[PDB]
Design a protein around this ligand. Structure first.
Ligand SMILES: CNCC[C@H](Oc1ccc(C(F)(F)F)cc1Br)c1ccccc1
Ligand SMILES: CNCC[C@H](Oc1ccc(C(F)(F)F)cc1Br)c1ccccc1
Ligand SMILES: [K+]
Ligand SMILES: [K+]
Ligand SMILES: [K+]
Lengths: 261, 257
């Protein structure tokens, strides 16, 4: 019904205003802190290095940013050996577009690169949708057979179909939270050398297809990653996304029969 | 069948290898160009400014990047008046997480900010799913009633149901391409001050929920945006996403029958 659609809309607008106030309270003090630190460090550099003019400083900072925007770190000369568009990294970038994660640590700079990216997303995102619905249907049948087995057991125990379906879904959600969320975060903690939080934050930001790109697997210039690392990460992204898609498909299929009745 | 699932997988792996080689050919020459330019400009700064040590330079460049990562432009001090976490911009950030766009121009820096963001996405993304399916079902009924009206008219004209349905869907797709793709891109071109391509690229990357963050509406520290701009951008994202979801649902309902 539309009456409940407007109800969902009010809850969402309230949730965004709430979220907004919480994010402000948590991040604005640090944002205002870094605002002051940069202003101090720049004014400090100019007073410590008299031979540098304020405009000469601005020109360099601009050059540093211009390079960083293109995906080239303006730190060190030895870093000019590792590419972001090599077959391997270009494969993982292509997959980043197709999964709608769109990390953002690297993006097309060329006009043609942007043109191709528009067309690559337009046809590629539905192509992945088919693969995800493919694995989603296969896993959904396995979920359906598993729930049917539990349904026959708890039917004798005098338990409602909705109560069985709800508890089963929580269990499937928890199963994926260990296998595809907890276990890989622990692996990223040791491999990438991130904190316990940064690792879980990365996995959540990844598997939700939010993809901030403030944390990317196989992104460190310092860490000497193995050849199988980046393909294993995208493979985990594929199995992980398909698992939570198969659970979401299962919930959606039940709600469609609920709307019909 | 599982045999047909492996078939799609090969097409996807081929598509990624294809896409990868094209992106390489388009971006690697520029990436290698900028690699050389920064190496020259830095070495140039040190030879032009003898009083600056190579490490003293690295320390400053690091400070400039550290600020940029936190969402503070290391260009000018007057820019330190425009916030990224003010109620309006914080509402838009909240809205970016929920829609799974996650731009990446700005992200939570605080440990607590990251903790809240994990929980905010866990409950917020399904909450949006319901709203998108909600508007998707309501608009889908309107699009079903519209096509049924046209179907009764052209049935007497001896036109097949598939031919009517196909032409109608193309028209609904084209309608959204003007209202939610063309018209907003033209608005962002004038407001944000982007090129014709950059604005269409933004609208496409935004609506496909890819969200690279290399372009974001209401992201410029220099541009003095209106109070209504940042939320309206998200409301366009809401109406736009729901419209194309409702068209996709309509095609999906026909394929099931
Ligand atoms: O969709 C999702 C897919 C994955 C997750 C999570 F990462 F497991 F939490 C959360 C959501 Br919401
Ligand atoms: O989903 C989509 C929603 C919108 C668009 C487009 F931006 F109109 F092209 C493309 C896709 Br794919
Ligand atoms: K997404
Ligand atoms: K995204
Ligand atoms: K993103």
């Amino acid at each position: 019904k539309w009456k409940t659609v407007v109800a969902i809309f009010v809850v969402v607008v309230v949730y965004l205003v709430t979220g907004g106030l919480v994010f402000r309270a948590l991040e604005q003090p640090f944002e205002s802190s870094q605002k002051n630190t940069i202003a101090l460090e720049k004014a400090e550099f100019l007073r410590d290095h008299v031979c540098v003019s304020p405009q000469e400083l601005e020109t360099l900072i601009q050059h540093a940013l211009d390079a960083d925007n293109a995906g080239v770190s303006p730190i060190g000369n030895s870093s000019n050996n590792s590419s972001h568009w090599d077959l391997g990294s270009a494969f993982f970038f292509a997959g980043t577009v197709i999964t709608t994660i769109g990390y953002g640590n690297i993006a097309p700079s060329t006009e043609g690169g942007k043109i191709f990216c528009i067309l690559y997303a337009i046809f590629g995102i539905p192509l992945f949708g088919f693969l995800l619905a493919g694995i989603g249907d296969q896993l959904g049948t396995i979920f359906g057979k598993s729930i049917a087995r539990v349904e026959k057991v708890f039917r004798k125990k005098q338990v409602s179909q909705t109560k069985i379906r709800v508890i089963s879904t929580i269990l499937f959600i928890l199963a994926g939270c260990i296998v595809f969320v907890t276990i890989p975060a622990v692996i990223f903690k040791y491999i990438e050398g991130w904190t316990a939080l940064e690792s879980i934050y990365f996995v959540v930001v990844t598997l939700t297809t939010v993809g901030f790109g403030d944390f990317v697997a196989g992104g460190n210039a310092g860490i000497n990653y193995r050849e199988w690392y980046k393909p294993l990460v995208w493979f985990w992204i594929l199995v992980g996304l398909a698992y939570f898609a198969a659970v979401l498909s299962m919930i959606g299929d039940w709600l469609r029969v609920l709307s019909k009745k």
